[PDB]
Design an enzyme around this catalytic site. Structure first.
Site, mmCIF file in Angstrom:
data_model
loop_
_atom_site.group_PDB
_atom_site.id
_atom_site.type_symbol
_atom_site.label_atom_id
_atom_site.label_comp_id
_atom_site.label_asym_id
_atom_site.label_seq_id
_atom_site.Cartn_x
_atom_site.Cartn_y
_atom_site.Cartn_z
ATOM 1 N N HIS A 124 -3.757 6.112 3.539
ATOM 2 C CA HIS A 124 -4.534 4.927 3.160
ATOM 3 C C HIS A 124 -3.944 3.644 3.726
ATOM 4 O O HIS A 124 -4.647 2.796 4.287
ATOM 5 C CB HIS A 124 -4.603 4.912 1.643
ATOM 6 C CG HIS A 124 -5.339 3.797 0.994
ATOM 7 N ND1 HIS A 124 -4.728 2.626 0.604
ATOM 8 C CD2 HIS A 124 -6.647 3.690 0.644
ATOM 9 C CE1 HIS A 124 -5.628 1.837 0.049
ATOM 10 N NE2 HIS A 124 -6.800 2.460 0.060
ATOM 11 N N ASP B 139 0.856 -1.203 0.000
ATOM 12 C CA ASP B 139 0.000 0.000 0.000
ATOM 13 C C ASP B 139 0.884 1.243 0.000
ATOM 14 O O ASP B 139 1.963 1.191 -0.605
ATOM 15 C CB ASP B 139 -0.998 -0.055 1.152
ATOM 16 C CG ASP B 139 -2.303 0.662 0.881
ATOM 17 O OD1 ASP B 139 -2.271 1.902 0.763
ATOM 18 O OD2 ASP B 139 -3.357 -0.016 0.780
ATOM 19 N N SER C 23 -11.147 -1.209 -0.142
ATOM 20 C CA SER C 23 -9.861 -1.066 0.519
ATOM 21 C C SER C 23 -9.969 -1.304 2.027
ATOM 22 O O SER C 23 -8.999 -1.756 2.647
ATOM 23 C CB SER C 23 -9.267 0.319 0.271
ATOM 24 O OG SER C 23 -8.640 0.428 -0.982
ATOM 25 N N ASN D 98 -14.015 -0.439 -6.435
ATOM 26 C CA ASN D 98 -15.054 0.497 -6.084
ATOM 27 C C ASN D 98 -15.789 1.031 -7.309
ATOM 28 O O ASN D 98 -16.137 2.221 -7.276
ATOM 29 C CB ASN D 98 -14.491 1.720 -5.341
#
Length: 279
Positions: free
Chosen positions: A69, A39, A224, A161
């Site tokens: 994130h 990430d 996520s 998404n």
């Protein structure tokens, strides 16, 4: 063990019902397992990680999380307050820049990195990789995911998404890994969650509270956020001896809450991650 006033998602994967606020889990809490968070990095210094987080690789000028994130996902995996597996070891691999973007070549390198790097870590209870990232279909990205899985790491990846079929995204579309869609606190499919036959499981993904950079916390939404719930759950169940890196996705499907989500399109699994913990 019981954690009162837990984030809803933690409460949800230890419940047969929505609408409760305590998280229940075996005190082993994933001790002796490892989860890689691939990430934007992880702010290891956050109090919430208690010394159990570390950056092990970056492809950029820093291994710090300048985005948040990766820190949020890591928090859902294993932070003391916001995490599923509260005693796992967390390893940060920064494949994504501080704007949250990354080249597929870099992501692939990170994946093969993890397949090797686990041999440099102590993870007697097993190894998980959490991948809250993706883009358009790439066979080479999927193949890298499949290698990492094959290598003996439980790979959990976001469905995406786009409110579309996950078949057109990678590594979501890789069949041999664990593809995770998102649900909300009312057991609805998240509005943005991808779907399709290549989904393995759903986890909480709408309005998920977790760690953020600057020693902070925040609530955000995405597949996520669902992915590290499943990654943590895997690590937790591997520590319990219940399953293995190779079989954990299947096990999680086997033991899921079944048929409880709304607006699951025909052909998509109606399975919600559940730790089946009985205190």
């Amino acid at each position: 063990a019981a954690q009162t006033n837990a984030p809803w998602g933690l409460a949800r994967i230890s419940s047969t019902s929505p609408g409760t606020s305590t998280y229940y889990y075996d005190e082993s809490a994933g001790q002796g397992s490892c989860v890689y968070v691939i990430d934007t990095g992880i702010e290891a210094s956050h109090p919430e990680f208690e010394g159990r987080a570390q950056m092990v690789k970056t492809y950029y000028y820093s291994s710090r999380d300048g985005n948040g994130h990766g820190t949020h996902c890591a928090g859902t995996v294993g932070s003391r307050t916001y995490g599923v597996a509260k005693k796992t070891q967390l390893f940060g691999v920064k494949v994504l820049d501080d704007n949250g973007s990354g080249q597929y070549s870099t992501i692939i390198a990170g994946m093969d990195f993890v397949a090797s790097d686990k041999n440099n870590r102590n993870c007697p209870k097993g190894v998980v990789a959490s991948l809250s990232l993706g883009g358009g279909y790439s066979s080479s990205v999927n193949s890298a995911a499949a290698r990492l899985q094959s290598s003996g790491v439980m790979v959990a990846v976001a469905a995406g998404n786009n409110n579309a079929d996950a078949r057109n995204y990678s590594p979501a579309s890789e069949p041999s890994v664990c593809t995770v869609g998102a649900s909300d606190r009312y057991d609805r499919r998240s509005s943005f969650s991808n779907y399709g036959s290549v989904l393995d499981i759903f986890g909480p993904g709408t309005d998920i509270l977790s760690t953020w950079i600057g020693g902070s916390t925040r609530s955000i939404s995405g597949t996520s956020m669902a992915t590290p719930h499943v990654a943590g759950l895997a690590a937790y169940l591997m520590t319990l001896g219940k399953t293995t890196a190779a079989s954990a996705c299947r096990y999680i499907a086997d033991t899921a809450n079944k048929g409880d989500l709304s607006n699951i399109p025909f052909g998509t699994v109606n399975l919600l991650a559940y730790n089946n913990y009985q205190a």
